[PDB]
Write a protein that binds this ligand. Structure first.
Ligand SMILES: Nc1ncnc2c1ncn2[C@@H]1O[C@H](COP(=O)(O)OP(=O)(O)O)[C@@H](O)[C@H]1O
Lengths: 586, 579
DNA sequence: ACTGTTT
DNA sequence: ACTGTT
């Protein structure tokens, strides 16, 4: 069971030295490692080479779904005959249940499930049991609560051809996973028994037809529900529960008894504290949910009662995707300096929101037990970890003994030239630079601190006659795609906005980045943000960065210096190999 | 009030003659009118001119949401100080309830509402009551069932600044909709009552609050509040509260059910009769308790106490008697509109036949085309290739063929099927050298998949377009083709939005004589148009026979290319590909 | 063809 | 900043 890397290309630039150093690290027993990979060096390809050499089930963590999406595409292209999986949240929209004490307002949980993503998540989890050649591209959804791996093996009806099973036990195993029997009104969530045939109906109007020989599964075939076309014949099939939670029916009565025991104890507490309104709200909400459970078996926000339903002790650590991975497994953190604080921050935020709900009698204290992992908990799972970032964070720096630099680009393209200009005459100067780039058919990206500052420059630039677009803080993964497209094609020559660190703004047509108020206090003015902003001008052979500031900040100095370092190393390699860099590549 | 058209540009080419002829038509009492506007002539502005001159509440119908979207943007730019509204379906996902007799399979209705679209629809409907300077860009959703505009006036709490209303009456008007009073647990669907203040937590996802400050019996101020922050999102002058979301109706359904049960039994349809009682009786108990049930829409005719057979209330009823309708791509929209009713009835009839629904379910339906025709006061069909309906109803056509850019309709060369590919290959190879792109149309997916695989073997950067492609995949594919990632596009349907790109200098119609929908007179004219954004735009038709369809297309192009060439002579214009 | 469509 | 979130 080995990873087969399918590429026409071979490692160029400093990818060979990087792979050798990172594979030796894993072999030598090094846990924490960091790849300092500049943008344009082929980070994914280096990683793919490492994944192949080390041959270990891997987990790729991305700080956003857009980035995760691209990585999945990139990895599926390199490993077509291996298990490349995608594990992200199945909610298309998720408004968590919350209380705003600031205004005495209660926000009910409102969410919408994407069934395609749910199918993908199932492909991912079940793949970890089948084979060792697995790569899972995931978001922070990998540190959130999931069922016990043993519980997963039990709650999934897996059927193979020529398998010995009594038609009647199959039915029991199906009812056990929330399916009903309906030979009269056949639909999603139900199964029907025609002859020596069981038809199972689990979105996507598809259904499994199991033909029985006597006590042996004679044949298994997929059918289109809307047409009745025999869509294809199968050898294996895994039926998943009809519900979105579906609790184990047996262990449910003790759980209801345990909640009532916690509720009574919490009421004596709230009363012997004078919190009477909160105590009234708690009884009303809890007692309702318990009656909904006794009747249906489910209730809205049943997840809050999770600790009691699994009969697990208080304080207990949740089961996560990380538990479905073997002891000997690798983790690769993309944009580590972003992901690490994100991962670290999910527990604190979750507890913060849930604590206010507890304090005001909306939920019992056991609600806090249904949570993502503590960073300490996540750390206990790190077997072999590789942090990937162009600007690694403090955590990665403290844990990596030696950095693994990958700064040389295959195209030979260099990191930009930074010129620092005064704030007095900022705009007129920038205007002249923008005007000059239009003449040369090049594009400009400008950053501000305030949205107001940004809108004002857009309105003035539009008055002069410059084709401009202002980037809003909240932009959809289409408005983005369209905006990058139009700037590339030339519908816009300049882009204004706070935050150029959005995906895909690294365009070959951009020859100038202008950082207005470079010396001012702001997140996007930090050493790391500046280095990342500078990188937006590096896809161009004549790439330049202009910093408008009166003072040179420690942040600016570091950024200016790191760029000098890299630009020099690259220029020295271009001398030794006789290369002249050319813009949009090839 | 009047429509104020805000444009920096003035009508060029044949736009002035078009506007004059179309405005005179409305004034002279016409009836039905058609605007034969070629792609690239600025049809929307001609329409905007007409909308301003005639000054009448208007409805724009588009055959797809993408096209509807662009038109809304275009109209919002021209009338910024008027009511430009968007009315399309609020469902992000809709699987209608259906039965598959071929396999005895029942498909439950599964839906998922887009709240932003719902807000937009409400802005549209309520705007029609407030002002006469309204333009509504809509899809076929405008011929589907809606509440009586009268029932709307009653079931919507509309509040204005000075106003004057009893604080207590406002509460009654809120409870009368579906609002509960909760000062203890304030949340979605409830109202509060603080001091001389009423805080209302509306319907969904925005997570906003309406704070009504009352000066004795006057509405002193109405201001929007961020529920998640407590932040005062902005001050308002008008606000419309929508519902949080009968006995005679329940009695009437039971009366229809009993009558339908005697019928079914007498015909021996016992399984269907069991299914009907079970389903109906359940829904009626759900209605007596809650007031709602899943699929309550099916009972709509009984709930409005209207007679059987009755025509539904539509967006068209909210418009004044004196109103205008503008049909974009009429040769596409008209058949669409006309086809709605037939499909709906077909699906609902099978459900009725098998005892899933009562026969009154058919009364909850879109409009009949005959019904829609009875609403036409002043109608303007806009199309580059008008359909038979528009042709039969328009007395005189209003042509707008002259482009401001001077760009001409392509040159069509007809080549034999024998040597089809080698010839096409040579033409594609030649365009790569000149940095131009190619679009190829086949009939079957085999021919399409097969040419892509062979062109990729030769070394041509190609992409095959799937029959099923999402809006993002479309936008991306075109983008990549413009930027040069691919030099050629292969596929069945080239009539997809935005496929007419300035970089494309060649359209190749493989099996041009082979007869299918996309080989019809009209389809060919639209396919030809994909090469008209280029100054050296050429079309190659691979066929052995010249079909009536081909002749018409070839001739209309000759006509339009000649008129344009003659205009370019008289005004001394040299066309340039604008990229 | 392909998109539209169910207070 | 901005995105994550059986
Ligand atoms: N040695 C190589 N030869 C050719 N292409 C390569 C090589 N290494 C990487 N690539 C490709 O170069 C592209 C650009 O690199 P980059 O923008 O840094 O993306 P990433 O870091 O995600 O791989 C990617 O499509 C990648 O697959």
């Amino acid at each position: 069971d080995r990873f087969e890397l399918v590429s026409k290309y071979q490692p160029q630039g400093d990818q060979p030295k990087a792979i050798e150093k990172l594979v030796k690290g894993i072999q030598e027993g090094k846990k924490h490692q960091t790849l300092l990979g500049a943008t344009g060096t082929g980070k994914t390809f280096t990683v793919s080479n490492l994944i192949k050499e080390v041959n270990k089930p891997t987990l790729v963590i991305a700080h956003n779904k857009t980035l995760a999406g691209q990585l999945y595409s990139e990895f599926k292209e390199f490993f077509p005959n291996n298990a490349v999986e995608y594990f992200v949240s199945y909610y298309d929209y998720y408004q968590p249940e919350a209380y705003v004490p600031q205004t005495d307002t209660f926000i009910e949980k409102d969410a919408s499930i994407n069934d395609e993503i749910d199918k993908l998540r199932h492909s991912a989890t079940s793949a970890l049991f089948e084979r060792r050649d697995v790569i899972i591209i995931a978001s922070v959804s990998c540190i959130y609560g999931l069922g016990s791996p043993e519980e997963y093996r039990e709650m999934v009806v897996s059927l193979r051809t020529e398998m010995e099973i009594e038609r009647n036990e199959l039915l029991r195993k199906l009812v056990d996973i929330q399916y009903a029997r309906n030979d009269i009104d056949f639909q999603r969530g139900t199964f029907r028994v025609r002859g020596d045939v069981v038809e199972i109906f689990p979105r996507d109007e598809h259904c499994v037809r199991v033909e029985f020989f006597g006590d042996e599964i004679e044949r298994i075939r997929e059918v289109d529900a809307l047409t009745g076309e025999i869509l294809g014949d199968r050898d294996h099939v895994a039926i998943f529960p009809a519900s979105h939670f579906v609790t184990r029916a047996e262990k449910m009565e003790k759980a209801i008894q345990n909640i009532e025991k916690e509720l009574e104890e919490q009421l004596k507490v709230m009363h012997e504290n004078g919190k009477l309104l909160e105590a009234q709200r708690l009884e009303q909400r809890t007692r309702y949910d318990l009656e909904m459970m006794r009747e249906m078996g489910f209730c809205s926000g049943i997840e809050n009662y999770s600790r009691h339903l699994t009969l697990r002790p208080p304080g207990s650590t949740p089961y996560t995707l990380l538990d479905y991975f073997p002891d000997d497994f690798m983790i690769v953190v993309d944009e580590s300096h972003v992901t690490i604080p994100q991962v670290r921050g999910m527990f604190n935020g979750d507890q913060a929101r849930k604590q206010v709900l507890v304090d005001h009698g909306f939920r019992l204290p056991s609600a806090l037990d249904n949570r993502p992992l503590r960073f300490e908990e996540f750390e206990k799972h790190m077997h072999n970890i590789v942090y990937v970032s162009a600007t690694p964070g403090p955590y990665e720096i403290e844990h990596t003994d030696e950095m693994v630099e990958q700064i040389i680009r295959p195209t030979g393209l260099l990191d930009p030239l930074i010129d620092v200009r005064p704030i007095e005459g900022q705009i007129d100067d920038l205007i002249g630079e923008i005007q000059a780039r239009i003449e040369r058919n090049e594009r400009v990206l400008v950053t501000t601190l305030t949205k107001k500052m940004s809108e004002d420059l857009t309105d003035y630039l539009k008055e002069i006659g410059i084709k401009v677009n202002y980037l809003h803080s909240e932009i959809k993964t289409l408005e983005r795609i369209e905006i990058i497209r139009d700037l590339r094609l030339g519908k816009y020559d300049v882009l204004v906005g706070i935050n150029l660190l959005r995906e895909g703004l690294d365009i070959p047509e951009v020859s100038l980045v202008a950082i207005l108020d470079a010396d001012k206090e702001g997140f996007l003015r930090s050493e790391r943000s500046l280095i990342q902003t500078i990188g937006r001008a590096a896809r161009n052979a004549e790439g330049r960065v202009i910093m408008y500031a009166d003072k040179i900040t420690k942040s600016m100095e570091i950024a200016i210096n790191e760029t000098k370092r890299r630009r020099e190393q690259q220029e020295r390699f271009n001398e030794e190999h006789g290369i002249t860099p050319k813009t949009i590549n090839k």
